[PDB]
Design a protein around this nucleic acid. Structure first.
Lengths: 1341, 79, 50
RNA sequence: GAGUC
């Protein structure tokens, strides 16, 4: 029960559990976010829509003219994908927006009856996303990475110890907006509440509320709980609630109702408290002492004179009590500060707070922000309000609001951007809470506390910035000029829009060169997630906490995919099935468990939601699609793990692989590999290079099919049907009549991309997979990318590896390889490098492109064309000239000697310099294609014309045959409708084609569809004639490059780079190595059978590195080839189809608890023999990550391969013929050659270009530079007594010009004498000291 | 200076009217002078660039670490 | 952590157990980046005295 | 961006 591609290559799944729901299209994140940016949805406030409504409608100063926004339109892209690649253009669509100018009258009230002007203006070109999910940035493929940051809202942070000898507890709530300055509230050492405003410094929280016009009285009212203190006669009575005595030492005889309650001294315990609570107490009998020490709530004015006896927040005292009762204010209202629950926090605060009213509050605000600027009323107010309450300046976004409201335990999900005043108060409440112990602290690193930015929200923000600057300009020009005759189009500027865009896309560090080493690198790299960037974490700002592994990463980020070194912990890969919710929180899918029974229902939960419920692992065993195996089962909840019974089971994992990222999912026996090496493994895969030959990975996870498919470097079938034409360049497919649209013809076209240059110098080669006239369905793999076999990821190739020591050639993970690898051309890398030539003009005169060069042989002349151009297909090496260039020289002032000599040989030589572009040495290969970019101004070269003529021919042929094949399919489709109600085959066909439009038959629904494809035919004409005329002009149009530049030549070089000693290779398990020697076939040990090995790894590389998976791969790998060899023999032996039938089926179904229940027998003989030959080259088996094949099932296969159960065989040493005293481990393993080429990494310098200021050699192989000798290295020489080597390094090898030059020629004169000088860096140094104004001079002896 | 003023202010006009970048020919016509002087002024327009501009995406190179000095001949040359 | 790893590499650990190990793994590797800086600077101090 | 310890 499987499709045609799968029928062709079925891999045997060992996976003991069924993945329920499908592996979601991985690169969906990018598209979905970006698509949101443009989403035409009126209500949905996002992207365009969001930004527009935030600013608009834009009203003028005078209140009579206004600018209104209607709606937007995206044009069809000015420049196509491929074309932009060619010319170095950014791929983009026009944005045009409908805007209306309305003018009210001044005099008539607001009579919009005067003037209404409207139009669609051009607002620039907006970079478009590809079908792949990539972006076209000045002719190179870039990807925008997802960005994690701390989400807007509230962070409740505690400093456990953190700071102090004392070791005091410091609580801080952090206010993080989308857009605006930041707010920090923290506890002083003596428990007093301070604010950091825009983390500037620390001042009293209370002052803010003063600015918000709260008197000290209102402050303490809202915060602290008032207590009614009645004074009658000479007795003082409080209105006491029982649970305020909570653990209160009795200071008096506490007479309530009847008899003595509380001991004079004995503490109130809970029983006492509950007893008096029961009594229902209103007023007790306190003595003289209790009120002295507390504080008064309101501002109690003296009725008698009118003057204040007590202000708010004064310490309570003896005489004041007498005077207030004398005023006849017999309802005083004391405060409650008995530590514990409600402590003296705000009270102490207010005393240290020097500020008084609204007025002095805003003074201090203003002062701290700009110390020394005089207090103008307007400035202070405006500052305060603009800081937190300005809408365009301060925006929390939906995000900030949601998380904020969930921090304080509110109810509304959405809100307005600006901070409502009640919010502020309530949080300070929660701070005071935590200080007492009502609630506890939220963690920085919680996945609910971190939010991710996709594409659209990034876009959103940067678009808003262009808008801001444009707003200054817009509102400015709206008031000066005349209102009537001037129109909207003259108003509007484009510059700053396009500026903002190019800054985001071009300048951003989150926007980078796609990793195109392999499909894996690309696909993985696109879903990588960075903690850095704007609004995000720095290197020094990062301690252990954030970089280390947070439990919430489970099923969301793969824990084991991050670069080694300093960026570790910062950048991580999204796990497989994980996706982002609306809010930009990561969600993971789970299966519902209804009362013990495991349903089919899938629920995505955020981190926050995850914290609540109780979920079983994927590995727990499933009872017959109902309940569980075990009565006590294994699960996790609220961030911890252990045992629970069936009934308590709420949810469950869909599959094991949901914890793992994509790259890691591909490594097979991950279960047996230590994470140290596991991590390394994933990274290695990313650095692997496609060879030419794709050999299907024999030991896969099944995941290789999905990886291929999603990378999108292959061709997939849109419709399915039958293949009409197959070319190694074009695949044309005729659709199933079922699926076919009655709109256009049923003809789907796939032009394949062949042999272009990737960013890393890699080759990009598509191979068609199916054959001609073959059947395919929707979503069939039609053509493969480079590192892909029939459906599957083919990172590389599989070879016979043997674990054992060789004569120290495999020492410390060094690799012994056979000559057979070269012989079979496996791991031969394809490289495509771009070389360039650049012709400008100076004051020195026009540089130009010619074949004429001073003092060169006809050797170079012969390989050049008319204009000085390489011929197509030329084989070229280091030192060879590719493109000729000449540059005007200045005056030739020669030494007298050279003057005479010129005269003597008599070759004057014109005032010109050889500027020609040459092949760099060491590299050499094949010039495959050449492109030229002429200037618009200067006239074209003959080379120029002939190549642009080629473009014409090619354009023509391509589009001509496009039309021709489309036409034939459409006419053939009309033939299917005329053949229904009108049998005529002899005189229709033999008669002309287009005289089938004079066709006037039955007038029912037969005649209508003819016109359907007839009008479509007229559009085939008008579209084509346009699509031609457009692409003719662009070819012929003068190509616009940088100022000063006449002409450019791009030269695409092919490098056939063979694997060699010093090249880098590895397997999936982290284990790697350099090739140390190529041994001839003879030297490698071999079987009794006679087959010798391919590669030899040293065993000692495994144990201490802790990666056993490679071993299991080896064993399973030989077994797979055992199957392949069984098949190979029975294939070569023909025999009977049914016999083959038997063997093969029993092979699949062998695995003890095999899930993948392979249906064979029904298979038609054709399908059978075909598949046979595929698995001829080894069977493809599937161990899923964790859900993998046990040792048992593996040994079982070894028996079926007729091999040793340990996978060891007695081998003969190919040198001696002596047998190895122990049987050794062999088998087939999947290997890869890394991007690291000794070819490029080779470098050495004698003498070359030097640095300008310091006069030392420049850096790197790039400049032909000298290597840097660092402090440590110097120190080496120091330890030995070695003065002369040191001094060499110091002088003749570096900054002494006289010294180095003199010593060079003395060396050439067989002297080898040193003769030291003086470091030029030293003189440099001296003069800089003088320039900074300090006198330093060299003392004579 | 004033000729430069003309340049950039008419740049905006022409970019929007024509659709894209202003090629020298059309610009030449619209500003009332000969093509020669257009290209001249174009290249003269550019200001000096920072010597210590961090071209190293990582503060590996201040562009001074690119600079080669043609003045000083090689020891090879001296030979 | 209270719950340990009962199985071994050869038999293969499970989902749950493997995740545990990343903590130690990552912690160790992260240690390399930032700790060798401390050692290095130390070394340079010592060298500059002696 | 990746290699080395």
């Amino acid at each position: 029960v499987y499709s045609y591609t799968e029928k062709k290559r079925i891999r045997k799944d060992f996976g003991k559990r069924p993945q329920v729901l499908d592996v979601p299209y991985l690169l969906s994140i990018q598209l979905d976010s970006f698509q949101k940016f443009i989403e035409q949805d009126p209500e949905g406030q996002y992207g365009l829509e969001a930004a527009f409504r935030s600013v608009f409608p834009i009203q003028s100063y005078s209140g009579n003219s206004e600018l209104q926004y209607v709606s937007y339109r995206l044009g069809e892209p000015v420049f196509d994908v491929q074309e932009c690649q060619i010319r170095g253009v950014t791929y983009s669509a026009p944005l045009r927006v409908k805007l209306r100018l309305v003018i009210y009258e001044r005099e008539a009230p607001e009579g919009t009856v005067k003037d209404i002007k409207e139009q669609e203006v051009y607002m620039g070109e907006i970079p478009l996303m590809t079908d792949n999910g990539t972006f076209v940035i000045n002719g190179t493929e870039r990807v925008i990475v997802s960005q994690l940051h701390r989400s807007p809202g509230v962070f409740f942070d505690s400093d456990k110890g953190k700071t102090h000898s004392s070791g005091k507890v410091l609580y801080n709530a952090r206010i993080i907006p989308y857009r605006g300055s930041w707010l920090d509230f923290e506890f002083d050492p003596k428990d007093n509440l301070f604010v950091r405003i825009d983390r500037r410094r620390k001042l009293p929280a209370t002052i803010i509320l003063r600015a918000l016009n709260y008197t000290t009285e209102q402050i303490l009212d809202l915060f602290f709980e008032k207590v009614i203190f009645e004074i009658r006669d000479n007795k003082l009575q409080m209105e006491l609630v029982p649970e305020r005595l909570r653990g209160e030492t009795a200071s008096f005889d506490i007479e309530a109702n009847g008899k003595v309650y509380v001991e004079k001294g004995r503490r109130i315990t809970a029983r006492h408290i509950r007893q008096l609570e029961k009594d229902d107490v209103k007023l007790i009998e306190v003595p003289v002492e209790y009120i002295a020490g507390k504080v008064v709530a309101k501002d109690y004015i003296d009725e008698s004179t009118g003057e204040l006896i007590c202000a708010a927040n004064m310490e309570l005292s003896l005489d004041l009590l007498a005077k207030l009762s004398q005023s006849g204010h017999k309802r005083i209202e004391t405060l409650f500060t008995n530590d514990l629950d409600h402590g003296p926090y705000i009270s102490e605060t207010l005393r240290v707070d020097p500020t008084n009213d609204r007025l002095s509050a805003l003074v201090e605000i203003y002062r701290m922000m700009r110390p020394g600027e005089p207090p103008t009323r307007e400035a202070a107010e405006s500052l305060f309000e603009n800081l937190f309450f300005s809408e365009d300046r301060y925006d929390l976004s939906a995000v900030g609001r949601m998380k904020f409201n969930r921090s304080l335990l509110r109810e509304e999900i959405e809100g307005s951007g600006i901070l409502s005043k009640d919010d502020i108060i309530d949080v300070m409440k929660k701070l005071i809470d935590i200080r007492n112990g009502k609630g506890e602290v939220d963690d920085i690193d919680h996945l609910g506390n971190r939010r991710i930015r996709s594409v659209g929200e990034m876009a959103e923000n940067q678009f808003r910035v262009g808008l801001v600057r444009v707003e200054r300009a817009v509102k400015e020009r709206l008031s000066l000029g005349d209102l009537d005759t001037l129109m909207p189009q003259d108003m509007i500027n484009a510059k700053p829009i396009s500026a903002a865009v190019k800054e985001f896309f071009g300048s951003s560090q989150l926007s980078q060169f796609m990793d195109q080493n392999n499909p894996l690198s690309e696909i993985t790299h696109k879903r990588r997630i960075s903690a850095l960037g704007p609004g995000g974490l720095t290197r020094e700002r990062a301690g252990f906490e954030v970089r280390d592994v947070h439990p919430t990463h489970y099923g969301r980020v793969c824990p084991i995919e991050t670069p080694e070194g300093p960026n570790i912990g910062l950048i991580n890969s999204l796990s497989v099935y994980a996706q982002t919710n609306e809010y930009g929180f990561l969600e993971t899918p789970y299966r519902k468990v209804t009362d013990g029974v495991v349903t089919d229902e899938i629920h995505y939960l955020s981190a926050i939601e995850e914290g609540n419920y109780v979920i079983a692992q994927a590995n727990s065993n499933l009872d017959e699609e109902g309940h569980f195996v075990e009565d006590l089962v294994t699960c996790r909840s609220k961030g911890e793990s252990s045992l629970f019974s069936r009934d308590q089971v709420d949810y469950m994992d869909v599959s094991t692989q949901q914890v793992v990222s994509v790259g890691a999912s591909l490594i097979p026996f991950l279960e047996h590999d230590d994470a140290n090496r596991a991590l390394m493994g994933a990274n290695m895969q990313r650095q692997a290079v496609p060879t030419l030959r794709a050999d299907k990975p024999l030991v896969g996870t099944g995941m290789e099919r999905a990886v291929a498919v999603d990378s999108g470097v292959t061709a997939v079938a849109k419709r399915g049907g039958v293949v009409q034409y197959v070319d190694a360049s074009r695949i044309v497919i005729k659709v199933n009549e079922d699926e076919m649209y009655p709109g256009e013809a049923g003809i789907d076209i796939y032009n394949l991309t062949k042999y272009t240059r990737s960013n890393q110098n890699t080759c990009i080669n598509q191979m068609p997979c199916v054959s001609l006239g073959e059947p395919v369905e929707r979503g069939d793999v039609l053509a493969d990318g480079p590192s892909t076999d029939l459906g599957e990821l083919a990172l590389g190739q599989n070879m016979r590896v043997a674990f054992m020591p060789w004569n120290g050639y495999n020492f410390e993970d060094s690799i012994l390889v056979s000559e057979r690898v070269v012989q079979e051309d496996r791991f031969t890398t394809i490289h495509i490098q771009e070389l360039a030539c650049v012709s400008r003009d100076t004051k020195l005169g026009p540089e130009e492109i010619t074949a004429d060069i001073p003092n060169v042989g006809e050797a170079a002349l012969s390989k050049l064309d008319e204009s000085g151009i390489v011929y197509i297909g030329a084989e070229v090496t280091g030192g060879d000239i590719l493109v000729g260039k000449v540059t005007p020289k200045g005056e030739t002032q020669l030494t007298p000697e050279e003057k005479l000599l010129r005269a003597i040989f008599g070759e004057k030589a014109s005032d010109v310099k050889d500027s020609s572009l040459r092949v760099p040495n060491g590299v050499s290969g094949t010039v495959i294609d050449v492109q030229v970019f002429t200037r618009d101004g200067v006239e074209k070269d003959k080379r120029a014309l002939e190549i642009e003529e080629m473009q014409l021919k090619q354009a023509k042929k391509d589009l001509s045959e496009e039309l021709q094949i489309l036409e034939a399919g459409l006419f053939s489709r009309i033939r299917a409708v005329l053949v229904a109600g009108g049998v005529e085959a002899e005189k229709l066909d033999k008669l002309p084609r287009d005289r089938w439009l004079e066709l006037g038959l039955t007038d029912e629904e037969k005649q209508n569809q003819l016109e359907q494809l007839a009008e479509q035919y007229d559009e085939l004409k008008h579209e084509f004639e346009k699509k031609l005329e457009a692409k003719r002009r662009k070819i012929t149009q003068g190509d616009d490059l940088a100022p000063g530049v006449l002409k450019i030549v791009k030269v695409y070089l092919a490098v056939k780079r063979r694997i060699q000693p010093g090249d880098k290779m590895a397997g999936r398990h982290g284990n790697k190595g350099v090739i140390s020697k190529i041994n001839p076939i003879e030297d490698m040990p071999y079987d009794e059978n006679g087959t010798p090995v391919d590669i030899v790894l040293n065993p000692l590389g495994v144990p201490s590195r802790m990666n056993i998976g490679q071993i299991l791969e080896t064993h399973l790998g030989m077994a797979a080839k055992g199957i392949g060899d069984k098949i190979n023999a029975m294939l070569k032996q023909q025999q009977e189809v049914a016999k083959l039938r038997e063997f093969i089926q029993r092979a699949y179904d062998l695995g003890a608890d095999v899930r993948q229940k392979v249906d064979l027998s029904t298979f038609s003989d054709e399908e059978v023999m075909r598949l046979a030959e595929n698995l001829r080259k080894g069977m493809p088996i599937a161990t899923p990550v964790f859900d993998g094949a046990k040792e048992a099932e593996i040994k079982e296969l070894l028996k079926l391969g007729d091999l040793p159960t340990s996978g060891q065989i007695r081998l003969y040493d190919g040198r001696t013929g002596e047998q190895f005293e122990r049987p050794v481990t062999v088998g087939y393993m999947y290997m890869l050659k890394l991007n690291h080429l000794v070819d490029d990494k080779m470098h050495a310098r004698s003498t070359g270009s030097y640095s300008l200021v310091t006069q030392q050699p420049l850096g790197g192989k790039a400049q032909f530079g000298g290597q840097r000798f660092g402090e440590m290295e110097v120190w080496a020489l120091e330890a030995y007594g070695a003065a002369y080597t040191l001094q060499e390094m110091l002088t003749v090898k570096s900054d002494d010009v006289n010294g180095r030059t003199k010593m060079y020629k003395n060396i050439v004169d067989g002297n080898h004498q040193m003769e030291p000088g003086m470091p030029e860096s030293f003189n440099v140094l001296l003069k800089e000291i003088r320039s900074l104004g300090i006198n330093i001079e060299l003392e004579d002896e | 200076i004033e000729t430069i003023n003309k340049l950039n202010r008419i740049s905006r006009q022409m970019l929007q009217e024509m659709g894209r970048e202003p090629t020298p020919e059309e610009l030449a016509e619209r500003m009332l002078m000969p093509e020669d002087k257009i290209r001249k002024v174009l290249k003269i327009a550019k200001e000096p660039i920072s010597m210590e501009t961090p071209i190293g995406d990582d503060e590996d190179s201040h562009l001074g670490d690119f600079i080669e000095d043609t003045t000083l001949e090689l020891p090879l040359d001296s030979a | 952590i209270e719950t340990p790893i009962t199985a071994n590499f050869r038999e293969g650990l499970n989902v749950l157990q493997y995740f545990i190990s990343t903590h130690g793994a990552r912690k160790g590797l992260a240690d390399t980046a930032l700790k060798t800086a401390n050692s290095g600077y130390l070394t340079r101090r010592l060298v500059d005295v002696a």
